[PDB]
Structure formats: structure tokens, C-alpha cells
Design a protein around this ligand. Structure first.
Ligand code: PK4
Ligand code: PK4
Ligand code: PK4
Ligand code: PK4
Lengths: 193, 193
């Protein structure tokens, strides 16, 4: 056997596993299956360690997985919160900055502050505000008054953030629905049955 | 879409990933590629968390992976050493107890003691001896005298243990060489080249 060709076949298989695990992670995020999401994320992280060179498509795939991981840890080394880390990934993925991209960005920006207020950590809420940001003075007064349920926070809500992110996830899910591993697996299941 | 059929396709794909990762783990163990082995092992462990029901074949596959993991940590919660844990797995795998099985068993039994002596921990070497075992009195005198390079230890050597285990690994490697994921990956590589 040729060690070089074996390593190449392993890299091809790792690429197939990555797309399958991104698909699975997307579905688990959409369905709210927390434990399944946690398990798929762990598998994705481990599989990604086996890849040392990634194409542009594979980089988008791993950054979508990292972004969803941060969003899922939103209410739970970097010196920033998970939602701030999701914002950094979101603003750096090679993707179009369309209307949906902007809506998700602004929702994460507000929720990075609101999740701290929901948890009763108002000093952290002001620290998140300072790192991200008359609009600013209005938002700072709201945080300062612990006005967690202000109409601004109710419009830029956690539920609205999750709904917009789930709409984006449906596009990723559609784009990867035909990838090799899930497609071959669905054929085996349809043949049974 | 049907959640039940999606979960079934994910279980089929996990089964394919498990066989591919067992193959990769076996090759890495045979080649002495330590870092590749460590990475494949981490991926295998994570993938196996996604399976809640295993067939007899899948149980053999995960126990072969666990056995090789313990052997690889041989010189590096359970209250026993890695080689003692490899011995427990080895004696419980659903496999034929042929000549090779016995040779590997006896080599691990001696090496579980010898690796402690190699590391200069003779109290641990006697504790391993007590947990595993005129032959016994001869072996205990050898450990007691720190006679690490006694002709008995040179015949039941670490190198001999690794050679016998590698011969067994070649049978696992041959048995799984045609599994779905590695086979489809090799076709893609051969088409390029
Ligand atoms: C999927 N992408 S990843 O590169 O495996 C990754 C790296 C670091 C942290 C996380 C959560 C992560 F998911
Ligand atoms: C600098 N703030 S902003 O980006 O202009 C802004 C204005 C209004 C609402 C939101 C969520 C927002 F992020
Ligand atoms: C592959 N089998 S396994 O079940 O993932 C496993 C469980 C516990 C410890 C180890 C090292 C292990 F590999
Ligand atoms: C109880 N000891 S034993 O199993 O009979 C034995 C005899 C000789 C050599 C070895 C390695 C051995 F394990």
C-alpha cells in the first residue's frame, strides 16, 4: 500500500464527515435538540482536527459550525462572552452581507448585552456594551436602570435572534442536503422502508 | 421531512464513520504515527457517543479501538494501569481464544509489570503483579530484585508484545479494508491519479 494515497483517501473521507456533521449540527440547532447538538459539535471538532488544509468551502463549513456553537452557548481564555465570539465569527465568514446578515448581526449585538441582564450580571452587561459600542446613550441608560424588559429589548429579543438565525440555518441545510454521506445514508434507509 | 428517517440515516452514517475510524486507528497503530493515532482515537470516541444501540460487529469494533488505546497509553478512576485495562478488554472481546490470543494475553500480563519497572516504580510493579497473579514466586523475586533485564523479561518483551499485537491488527485491517467509507474514498483518489 501507498502511505500517501491512504492519507489522501482519509482526507477525502474527513471532508465527507465534516459536511455530514455540519448538516446534523444544523438540524439539531433548528429542532432544539440540545444533547444531540452537543454530541454532534464534539464529533465535528474532533473530525476537523484531522484536516490540516481546507478549501474555501470547508472554511465556511467549520466557521458555520463554530458560529452555531457560540450561539448555542449564548446564555451559558477569550475574555469575551459566547455571543460576542459569535459576532466576531459572523463578521468574518466569507458570505454576502445581505439584509438577513445585518438583521442577525444587530440581534446578536443587543442579545450579547440582554443575556447578561437576564442572568442578573449588570456589570458584565455594561462591559459587553463597551466592547461592542444618541442611540448608545439610550442603550446605556436602559442597562444602567436594569430595564431588561424595555420595548427596545422586546423588539430585539432572544426569540427574534433565534428565529432569524434559524432562517439562515435553513439555507445552509438546503445547500448541504445533497452532500455525499447523508445522501448515501438516506438511500440505505429508503431501501429498508 | 421525517425526524425518524433522518435519525436512521444519521445512525447508518455513524456506523460507516466508526468502521472508517477503526481502520484509520489500526493503520496509525501499525505505522507508529502517535499524533495521528491520538487524533483518530478522539474522533472515534466522539463518533461512538452518537450511537446508542450497537450490533455484535459494532461492539467488537469499539472494543478493538479501546484495546489499542490502552496499549498505546501502556508506558504513560480505574485504580489499575492502562495495560491491565487492555487485558480486561482483551479477555472480554467476543473473539476466538486461539494461539495468537494467548500469546498477546501473556505478553500484556508481563509487560503490565515490566513497564512499571522501566519507569522506576517498583512498588507499583508489585501492586500490578498482585492484581494479575513456583512461577509466581520466581516472577516476584525478579521484581523484588529490580531485575528489569532478566532473560524472562527479555523473552516477554515490550517489542514482542507490540509485534504480536501488530500481527492481530493486520487481520482487523484486512477484515475492514473493504468497508463503505474507505472504499468510496479510495475510488475518488484513484480517479485523480
Ligand atoms: C467547528 N469548528 S472547529 O474549528 O472545530 C471549533 C474550534 C474551536 C471552538 C469550537 C466550538 C469549534 F467548533
Ligand atoms: C450603533 N448601533 S446600530 O448598529 O446603529 C443599531 C441601531 C438600532 C438597533 C440596533 C440593534 C443597532 F445595532
Ligand atoms: C473506542 N471506544 S469508546 O467506547 O469510544 C472508548 C471509551 C472509553 C475510553 C476509550 C479510550 C474509548 F476509546
Ligand atoms: C500464571 N502464569 S502463566 O500464565 O502460567 C505464565 C507462564 C509463563 C510465562 C507467562 C508470560 C505466563 F503468563
Amino acid at each position: 500500500e501507498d502511505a500517501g494515497l491512504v492519507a489522501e483517501a482519509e482526507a477525502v473521507a474527513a471532508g465527507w464527515m465534516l459536511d455530514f456533521l455540519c448538516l446534523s449540527l444544523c438540524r439539531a440547532f433548528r429542532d432544539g435538540r440540545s444533547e444531540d447538538f452537543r454530541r454532534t459539535r464534539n464529533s465535528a471538532e474532533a473530525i476537523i482536527h484531522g484536516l490540516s488544509s481546507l478549501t474555501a468551502c470547508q472554511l465556511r463549513t467549520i466557521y458555520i459550525c463554530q458560529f452555531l456553537t457560540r450561539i448555542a452557548a449564548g446564555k451559558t481564555d477569550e475574555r469575551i462572552t459566547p455571543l460576542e465570539s459569535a459576532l466576531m465569527i459572523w463578521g468574518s465568514i466569507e458570505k454576502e452581507h445581505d439584509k438577513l446578515h445585518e438583521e442577525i448581526q444587530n440581534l446578536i449585538k443587543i442579545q450579547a448585552i440582554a443575556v447578561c441582564m437576564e442572568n442578573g450580571n449588570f456589570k458584565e452587561a455594561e462591559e459587553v456594551f463597551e466592547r461592542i459600542f444618541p442611540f448608545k446613550s439610550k442603550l446605556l441608560m436602559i442597562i444602567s436602570q436594569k430595564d431588561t424588559f424595555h420595548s427596545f429589548f422586546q423588539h430585539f429579543s432572544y426569540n427574534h435572534m433565534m428565529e432569524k438565525i434559524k432562517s439562515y440555518v435553513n439555507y445552509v441545510l438546503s445547500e448541504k442536503s445533497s452532500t455525499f454521506l447523508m445522501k448515501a445514508a438516506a438511500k440505505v434507509v429508503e431501501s429498508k422502508r
